[PDB]
Amino acid sequence: ETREEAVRELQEMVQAQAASGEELAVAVAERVQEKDSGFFLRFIRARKFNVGRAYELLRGYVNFRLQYPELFDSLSPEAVRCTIEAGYPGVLSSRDKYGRVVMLFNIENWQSQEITFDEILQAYCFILEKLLENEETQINGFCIIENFKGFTMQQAASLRTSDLRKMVDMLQDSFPAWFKAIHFIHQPWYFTTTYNVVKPFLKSKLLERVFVHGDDLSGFYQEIDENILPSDFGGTLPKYDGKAVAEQLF
Numbered sequence: 001e002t003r004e005e006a007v008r009e010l011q012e013m014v015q016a017q018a019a020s021g022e023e024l025a026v027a028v029a030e031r032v033q034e035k036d037s038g039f040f041l042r043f044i045r046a047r048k049f050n051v052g053r054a055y056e057l058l059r060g061y062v063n064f065r066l067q068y069p070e071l072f073d074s075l076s077p078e079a080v081r082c083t084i085e086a087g088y089p090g091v092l093s094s095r096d097k098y099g100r101v102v103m104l105f106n107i108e109n110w111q112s113q114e115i116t117f118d119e120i121l122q123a124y125c126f127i128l129e130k131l132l133e134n135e136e137t138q139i140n141g142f143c144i145i146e147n148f149k150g151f152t153m154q155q156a157a158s159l160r161t162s163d164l165r166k167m168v169d170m171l172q173d174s175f176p177a178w179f180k181a182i183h184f185i186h187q188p189w190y191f192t193t194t195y196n197v198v199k200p201f202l203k204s205k206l207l208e209r210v211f212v213h214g215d216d217l218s219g220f221y222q223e224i225d226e227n228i229l230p231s232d233f234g235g236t237l238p239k240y241d242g243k244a245v246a247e248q249l250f
């Protein structure tokens, strides 16, 4: 069967490339040695069974883990659960019109000293790992909705460029085959400074996936069904509660 053959070919390529001794190639081989066929199929299917292209995706995925080991070193499922229960980030029960999983972040009252940017990215990675077990999601991918209505100047001043770059790299290196769009709503005037900080690190393909809506949600609602969104993202569903997602995942 083509699936089993494709996985075997990807595995052989992982080994063949590592044979060169090239640093990342060697790291990939080491870092995927415990993975099952399902894991390899994610990359294979995301690249329409093009093994070479699947391997390139895998390189970026592993590179992210090499560059940001603090996100993976002492990962505790229990701690990740708490972050998710707190609603950071959230996940909708229904897919959007593109068949995408919709992830959520509402910055209002986010206290970075209580729940760190790193902890939030750990939660993203933990969720995406589970979400990508699903074969439709392996193709359709996901989007992110960011409600910045409550983005304060204090929050803005506290954001570290190294943390913003980490998020860029999560989307651009770890999950680029799956990250499809990010929608910022209700962002204040000083969002411009935050955006400008990140802009140099965004490749053109990723830049084209960033949308900023402010207070006019007309276009936004054309993308994401108002009737699938929680009330704190302008929708008709109950205010987002991280408990439901958390229970489903764990």
Ligand SMILES: CC1=C(/C=C/C(C)=C/C=C\C(C)=C\C=O)C(C)(C)CCC1
Binding pocket: 089, 104, 105, 107, 117, 120, 146, 164, 167, 168, 182, 194, 195, 198, 202, 210
């Ligand atoms: C502008 C912009 C970004 C900035 C995101 C920010 C400012 C996130 C701030 C807080 C958190 C933790 C959100 C969690 O979802 C992205 C994602 C990096 C890269 C694409 C464009």
